[PDB]
Design a protein around this ligand. Structure first.
Ligand SMILES: OC[C@H]1O[C@H](O[C@@H]2[C@@H](O)[C@@H](O)O[C@H](CO)[C@H]2O)[C@H](O)[C@@H](O)[C@@H]1O
Ligand SMILES: OC[C@H]1O[C@H](O[C@@H]2[C@@H](O)[C@@H](O)O[C@H](CO)[C@H]2O)[C@H](O)[C@@H](O)[C@@H]1O
Ligand SMILES: OC[C@H]1O[C@H](O[C@@H]2[C@@H](O)[C@@H](O)O[C@H](CO)[C@H]2O)[C@H](O)[C@@H](O)[C@@H]1O
Ligand SMILES: [Ca+2]
Length: 559
């Protein structure tokens, strides 16, 4: 792609190809800012009746997602036109946006939904979904316009366009028990469990309440919808933060959930509940072509192995998109799209089996990461992250590679490579934590590069980063750091075929003193064909001040 191959096309409102009579925001990297939090770090502000932004379709489309920001505590409309003719109205809302903190309490980002004295609003953008009753061809002018009766103002960030097929029917009514107006999901599953000729349940087009955790047991179960634009599982929207969805017991290992969407009612992060799918220790489960929003996570694996997450869309969550922890091995996380997660979009946390091993995170896109990293790997052995696209992180790297234990029981990285192979990272990095007494100090925070290689309190070894393009990182391309006093010696850290373009500070930073009491990096890293182009200050910082760290310039480096 790089990244996921999805049926929708993403178009930035602010593209120079898009006529507008509204206000195009100049980019910045600020959280809590309508530019800093936008895709591409810009949007088009429509602030008077008749102001519009005009998109041009590059593929046919009957369905649209508008990422936008409106005033706090408001709902309303904005209009959509096709070739100059009005065609409908998006339902725009800040119900799920505006999370409050202060510049020195970004650790609270995502947790606190109420305004208050001295509090700044963050997480300002949200989405509106709309299907039209015609497929419009490539080349159609799709205008987003603020007409009389629409919201007082709106920031238009991007438009998703998609040509959605008609809904898919029950694959076989004699094998899939249908949910219906008078038969709930739970009742359909009970009928399935008690009749061995059934393969599962079918959930038709519609909106279907999920007001509970729905347990899958008995045997492997298929849950099949009509398509994610059609089958909508809906948490009770007059409630907030209800723990609903599916919970897969061991008897239902081998289950499949596919072709549906799930619309949670979380308005802030809660730690514990809030994963759409629970399946601790689950095996051989397939989750495919589902679209999930407004949960804490899609899935949080715990010693869960041989599972497949494929073709999913994870948007506007309050913590991680997918995390696999504590022994989870041999999983296939392939061709998934995340936008707006509230913590690491795709993560792997290895802990004591000794390691998470054999996982393949492939063809993944993670953008507009509202806190933490697009991709994060915490220890493990023989795990592959391949063909990644990451962009527009609010606070942290595009990719975190970390041997910090976080107080859990872990060995760190193992004896087989953790591989990052093929990745594009656009405008990644950010500010987090504190930097009291730090070297190379530019503000009150620690400052994170596009890729952070962090030796923590456990082994940091066997890391291969290759075929990566890092474009306009907030601060640095590659950032290497060792936690003191542990000073774990980094071994077999190699970087190959990497382009670092226009970093504002340095192409490569060896952290010398992140904060009081901390020191420089231990071990070394090798660089082959690593280009640093137009750095703001210099190509590499920290080399002379890092006497325990050896930079090896194998060949092909312009620094
Ligand atoms: O009050 C429930 C939600 O209403 C709006 O969203 C609509 C949603 O219910 C769904 O079924 O489809 C339509 C069309 O895509 C949505 O507009 C609000 O936007 C949402 O915030 C509410 O929770
Ligand atoms: O393995 C550590 C814990 O993971 C889960 O808790 C997470 C919490 O520590 C924090 O990271 O927030 C996320 C998102 O809300 C939580 O999933 C488990 O729920 C917990 O039991 C584990 O100890
Ligand atoms: O020391 C406990 C904390 O460790 C981690 O946070 C670190 C932060 O405190 C500061 O020192 O910066 C380093 C990175 O340079 C951070 O890793 C945990 O993330 C945090 O939850 C702990 O409280
Ligand atoms: Ca944008």
């Amino acid at each position: 792609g790089r990244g996921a191959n999805m049926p929708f096309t993403i178009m930035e409102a602010e593209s120079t190809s898009n006529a507008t009579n509204g206000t195009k925001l100049t980019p910045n990297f600020k959280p809590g800012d309508y530019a800093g939090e936008a895709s591409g770090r810009s949007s088009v502000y429509l602030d008077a009746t008749g102001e519009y932004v005009e998109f041009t379709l590059t593929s046919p489309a009957n369905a649209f997602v508008l990422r936008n920001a409106v005033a706090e505590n408001t709902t309303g409309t904005v209009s959509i036109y096709a070739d100059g003719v009005s065609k409908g109205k998006f339902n725009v809302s800040s119900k799920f946006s505006y999370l409050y903190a202060t510049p020195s309490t970004l650790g609270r980002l995502g947790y606190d939904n109420a305004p208050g004295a001295g509090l700044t609003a963050y997480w300002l953008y949200e989405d509106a979904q709309l299907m039209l009753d015609q497929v419009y061809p490539a080349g159609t002018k799709i205008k987003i316009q603020k007409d009389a009766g629409d919201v007082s103002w709106i920031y238009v960030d991007l438009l998703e366009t998609e040509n959605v097929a008609p809904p898919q029917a029950n694959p076989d009514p004699t094998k899939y028990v249908a949910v219906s107006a008078s038969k709930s999901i739970d009742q359909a599953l009970t009928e399935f469990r008690q009749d061995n000729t059934k393969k599962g349940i079918y959930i038709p087009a519609g909106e279907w309440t999920i007001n509970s955790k729905i347990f899958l047991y008995g045997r492997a179960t298929e849950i099949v919808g009509a398509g994610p634009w059609y089958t909508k599982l809906v948490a009770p929207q007059s409630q907030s933060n209800t723990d609903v969805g599916f919970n897969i017991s061991a008897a239902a290992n081998g289950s499949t959930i596919r072709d549906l969407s799930a619309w949670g009612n979380y308005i802030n992060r809660v730690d514990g509940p809030g994963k759409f799918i629970d399946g601790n220790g689950m095996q051989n489960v397939t989750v495919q072509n589902i679209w999930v929003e407004h949960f804490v996570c899609l899935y949080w694996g715990v010693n869960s192995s041989y599972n497949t997450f494929k073709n999913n869309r994870i948007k506007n969550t309050f913590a991680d998109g997918i995390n696999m922890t504590n022994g989870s091995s041999y999983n296939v996380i392939d061709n998934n799209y995340a936008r707006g997660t509230g913590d690491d979009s795709f993560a792997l946390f290895s802990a004591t089996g000794s390691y998470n091993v054999g996982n393949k995170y492939t063809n993944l896109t993670a953008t507009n990461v509202r806190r933490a990293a697009a991709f994060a790997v915490y220890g493990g052995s023989d795990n592959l992250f391949q063909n990644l696209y990451g962009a527009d992180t609010l606070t942290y790297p595009g990719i975190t590679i970390s041997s910090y234990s976080f107080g859990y029981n872990t060995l760190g990285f193992g004896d087989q490579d953790t591989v990052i192979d093929g990745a594009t990272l656009d405008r990644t990095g950010g500010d987090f934590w504190t930097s009291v007494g730090a070297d190379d100090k530019i503000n009150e925070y620690q400052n994170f590069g596009a890729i952070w290689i962090y030796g923590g309190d456990r082994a940091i070894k066997n890391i291969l980063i290759k075929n990566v393009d890092i474009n306009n990182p907030v601060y640095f391309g590659l950032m290497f750091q060792s936690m003191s006093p542990n000073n774990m010696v980094m071994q077999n850290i190699r970087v190959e075929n990497v382009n670092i373009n226009n970093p504002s500070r340095y192409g490569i930073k060896l952290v010398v003193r992140a904060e009081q009491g901390q020191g420089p990096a231990y071990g070394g890293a090798s660089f082959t064909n690593v280009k640093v182009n137009n750095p703001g200050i210099s190509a590499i910082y920290g080399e002379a001040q890092s006497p325990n760290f050896t930079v090896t310039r194998v060949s092909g480096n312009n620094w």
